[PDB]
């Protein structure tokens, strides 16, 4: 026994101590239900509402502005630093034609920044790494296809960052408008012929390629968030309870939060955020480097 | 017997169901009559108090899904308004006036989105170019998705907002639980105990639309068919008409 089987532990000791970074983004027009989703995914209350109840609160410039807040979660040993980016004014104007246009520039702002520092002859060994990772695309629950602005948007936004679709407030749809509502994005999707997360990699396995094929299928993910418990019978969850239902947000039978959670968090965390490097990131940098 | 209602809403809203819920019939979209939002008109012969019912739905196509909602976009619904306002006033001043084809509309239902948080920008320019020629009546779609709280926070919030706006609503001679929280199915659901009902199934629960503690649906259904109809025109013949034919001269 030689004991060079050790070296993963080597290399997880050493990124302990590191850290982890992910920066992600929430894209849609107020009253989706973002800022709950973020708190509920990452059981803490994070962010606010972009806007929250003050119509006043909407961006002065009658644009699209960009909320980023910074956050640190930990876990047994494992501590992640969370950038999670707003967009405030999105779709919220009377006109939203640029209503992409902030965001397009904030994505491409990052890259800009990694790689002057890539480029400089004192490198630092640590480069902050602000690059947006994911970018959570919330579609409203109302059954229609693709709208101008979810058209234009998605064209560029899927082009630049790992786009994941949700639908907010899934709940506004019963089972079958649940099926027949993300069949059609989906055709919709085909139509457009958009770069949906996740992408299938040389490099995955037989496996790997089937765990994509099965999250793939229910993409858009119906979402339910909730910060608040509720209570049942005695038995006490985090969910949503009117005067006529009660929600259950970790019920894998009534939506799809626990998938959306596994999904982000516990299988393609770290996919996410490596697929930003050699993907969007390298296809920034050569661009830059042709020109 | 003949009733005219607007439908301004975004597409998806909810409009037609609400339509074919409120009363009763699914066949009032089975008869069109013939960037800029379209207007759909409906015709339907409705069995509503015994009496046939002239029922003229007026319906928008893509109100607030244009990159840039100006005046512009939704101005046809505007000139629909007046226009019925003209033909009524042309076929007034003639000699043999005794069967108008009264199509004034009588009230405007506008489709707020279950947000939760305010009225948006255009939910604000659209009303405050309406009320004055229609009997506004302020709406909140597919409610079922907000908690009770929720409701009450969404219409404080929405009040104010009109309130600051000028935007006068409908006042039955019912208006303080204005925006109604509605929800819309006229198709046949089971609830818990078995019992045929309209409303949605969902896993979470069965919403009941004839039922008082689920919505508002009975005083919006009160206030548009049952009860306050009569007001209804009333306030647009004596009152909205004659403002704008004033205005005219
Ligand atoms: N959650 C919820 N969903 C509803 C309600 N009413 C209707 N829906 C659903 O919302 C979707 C939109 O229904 P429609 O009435 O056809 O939408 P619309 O306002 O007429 O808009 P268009 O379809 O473009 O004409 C339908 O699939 C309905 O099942 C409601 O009260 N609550
Ligand atoms: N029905 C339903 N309502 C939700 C859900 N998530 C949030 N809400 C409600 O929607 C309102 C606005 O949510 P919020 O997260 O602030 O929207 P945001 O503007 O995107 O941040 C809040 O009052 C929430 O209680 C959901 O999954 N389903
Ligand atoms: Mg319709
Ligand atoms: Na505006
Ligand atoms: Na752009
Ligand atoms: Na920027
Ligand atoms: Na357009
Ligand atoms: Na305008
Ligand atoms: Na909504």
């Given at each position: 026994?030689?004991?060079?089987?050790?070296?993963?532990?080597?290399?997880?000791?050493?990124?302990?101590?590191?850290?982890?970074?992910?920066?992600?983004?929430?894209?849609?027009?107020?009253?989706?239900?973002?800022?709950?989703?973020?708190?509920?995914?990452?059981?803490?209350?994070?962010?606010?509402?972009?806007?929250?109840?003050?119509?006043?609160?909407?961006?002065?410039?009658?644009?699209?502005?960009?909320?980023?807040?910074?956050?640190?979660?930990?876990?047994?040993?494992?501590?992640?630093?969370?950038?999670?980016?707003?967009?405030?004014?999105?779709?919220?104007?009377?006109?939203?034609?640029?209503?992409?246009?902030?965001?397009?520039?904030?994505?491409?702002?990052?890259?800009?920044?990694?790689?002057?520092?890539?480029?400089?002859?004192?490198?630092?060994?640590?480069?902050?790494?602000?690059?947006?990772?994911?970018?959570?695309?919330?579609?409203?629950?109302?059954?229609?296809?693709?709208?101008?602005?979810?058209?234009?948007?998605?064209?560029?936004?899927?082009?630049?960052?790992?786009?994941?679709?949700?639908?907010?407030?899934?709940?506004?749809?019963?089972?079958?408008?649940?099926?027949?509502?993300?069949?059609?994005?989906?055709?919709?999707?085909?139509?457009?012929?958009?770069?949906?997360?996740?992408?299938?990699?040389?490099?995955?396995?037989?496996?790997?390629?089937?765990?994509?094929?099965?999250?793939?299928?229910?993409?858009?993910?119906?979402?339910?968030?909730?910060?608040?418990?509720?209570?049942?019978?005695?038995?006490?969850?985090?969910?949503?309870?009117?005067?006529?239902?009660?929600?259950?947000?970790?019920?894998?039978?009534?939506?799809?939060?626990?998938?959306?959670?596994?999904?982000?968090?516990?299988?393609?965390?770290?996919?996410?955020?490596?697929?930003?490097?050699?993907?969007?990131?390298?296809?920034?940098?050569?661009?830059?480097?042709?020109? | 017997?003949?009733?005219?209602?607007?439908?301004?809403?975004?597409?998806?809203?909810?409009?037609?169901?609400?339509?074919?819920?409120?009363?009763?019939?699914?066949?009032?979209?089975?008869?069109?009559?013939?960037?800029?939002?379209?207007?759909?008109?409906?015709?339907?012969?409705?069995?509503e108090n015994g009496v046939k019912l002239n029922l003229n739905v007026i319906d928008t196509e893509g109100?607030?899904?244009?990159?840039?909602?100006?005046?512009?976009?939704?101005?046809?619904?505007?000139?629909?308004?007046?226009?019925?306002?003209?033909?009524?006033?042309?076929?007034?001043?003639?000699?043999?006036?005794?069967?108008?084809?009264?199509?004034?509309?009588?009230?405007?239902?506008?489709?707020?989105?279950?947000?939760?948080?305010?009225?948006?920008?255009?939910?604000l320019k659209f009303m405050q170019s309406v009320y004055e020629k229609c009997n506004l009546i302020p709406?909140?779609?597919?409610?079922?998705?907000?908690?009770?709280?929720?409701?009450?926070?969404?219409?404080?919030?929405?009040?104010?907002?009109?309130?600051?706006?000028?935007?006068?609503?409908?006042?039955?001679?019912?208006?303080?639980?204005?925006?109604?929280?509605?929800?819309?199915?006229?198709?046949?659901?089971?609830?818990?105990?078995?019992?045929?009902?309209?409303?949605?199934?969902?896993?979470?629960?069965?919403?009941?639309?004839?039922?008082?503690?689920?919505?508002?649906?009975?005083?919006?259904?009160?206030?548009?068919?049952?009860?306050?109809?009569?007001?209804?025109?009333?306030?647009?013949?004596?009152?909205?008409?004659?403002?704008?034919?004033?205005?005219?001269?």
């Amino acid at each position: 026994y030689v004991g060079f089987d050790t070296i993963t532990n080597q290399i997880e000791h050493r990124l302990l101590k590191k850290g982890f970074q992910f920066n992600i983004m929430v894209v849609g027009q107020s009253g989706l239900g973002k800022s709950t989703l973020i708190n509920t995914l990452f059981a803490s209350h994070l962010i606010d509402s972009a806007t929250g109840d003050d119509i006043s609160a909407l961006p002065v410039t009658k644009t699209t502005e960009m909320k980023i807040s910074t956050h640190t979660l930990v876990e047994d040993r494992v501590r992640l630093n969370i950038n999670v980016i707003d967009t405030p004014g999105f779709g919220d104007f009377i006109d939203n034609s640029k209503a992409w246009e902030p965001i397009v520039k904030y994505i491409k702002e990052q890259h800009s920044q990694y790689l002057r520092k890539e480029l400089t002859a004192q490198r630092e060994r640590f480069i902050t790494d602000t690059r947006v990772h994911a970018i959570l695309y919330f579609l409203q629950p109302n059954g229609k296809e693709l709208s101008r602005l979810d058209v234009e948007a998605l064209k560029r936004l899927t082009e630049i960052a790992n786009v994941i679709p949700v639908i907010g407030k899934s709940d506004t749809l019963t089972l079958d408008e649940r099926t027949e509502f993300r069949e059609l994005i989906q055709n919709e999707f085909e139509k457009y012929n958009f770069k949906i997360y996740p992408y299938d990699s040389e490099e995955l396995t037989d496996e790997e390629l089937e765990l994509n094929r099965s999250v793939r299928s229910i993409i858009p993910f119906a979402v339910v968030g909730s910060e608040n418990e509720i209570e049942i019978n005695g038995e006490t969850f985090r969910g949503r309870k009117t005067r006529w239902s009660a929600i259950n947000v970790e019920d894998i039978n009534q939506c799809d939060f626990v998938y959306l959670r596994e999904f982000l968090i516990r299988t393609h965390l770290q996919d996410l955020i490596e697929t930003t490097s050699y993907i969007h990131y390298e296809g920034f940098r050569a661009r830059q480097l042709i020109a | 017997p003949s009733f005219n209602l607007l439908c301004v809403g975004p597409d998806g809203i909810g409009k037609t169901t609400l339509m074919k819920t409120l009363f009763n019939n699914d066949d009032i979209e089975a008869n069109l009559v013939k960037h800029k939002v379209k207007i759909k008109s409906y015709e339907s012969v409705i069995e509503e108090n015994g009496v046939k019912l002239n029922l003229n739905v007026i319906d928008t196509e893509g109100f607030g899904d244009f990159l840039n909602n100006d005046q512009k976009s939704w101005d046809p619904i505007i000139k629909e308004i007046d226009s019925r306002f003209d033909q009524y006033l042309d076929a007034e001043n003639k000699i043999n006036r005794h069967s108008i084809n009264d199509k004034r509309i009588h009230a405007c239902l506008y489709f707020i989105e279950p947000t939760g948080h305010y009225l948006k920008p255009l939910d604000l320019k659209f009303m405050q170019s309406v009320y004055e020629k229609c009997n506004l009546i302020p709406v909140i779609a597919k409610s079922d998705i907000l908690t009770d709280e929720e409701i009450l926070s969404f219409k404080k919030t929405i009040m104010n907002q009109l309130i600051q706006s000028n935007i006068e609503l409908f006042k039955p001679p019912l208006f303080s639980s204005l925006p109604y929280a509605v929800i819309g199915s006229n198709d046949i659901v089971e609830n818990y105990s078995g019992n045929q009902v309209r409303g949605r199934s969902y896993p979470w629960g069965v919403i009941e639309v004839d039922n008082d503690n689920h919505s508002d649906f009975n005083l919006l259904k009160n206030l548009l068919i049952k009860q306050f109809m009569e007001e209804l025109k009333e306030r647009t013949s004596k009152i909205l008409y004659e403002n704008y034919r004033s205005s005219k001269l």
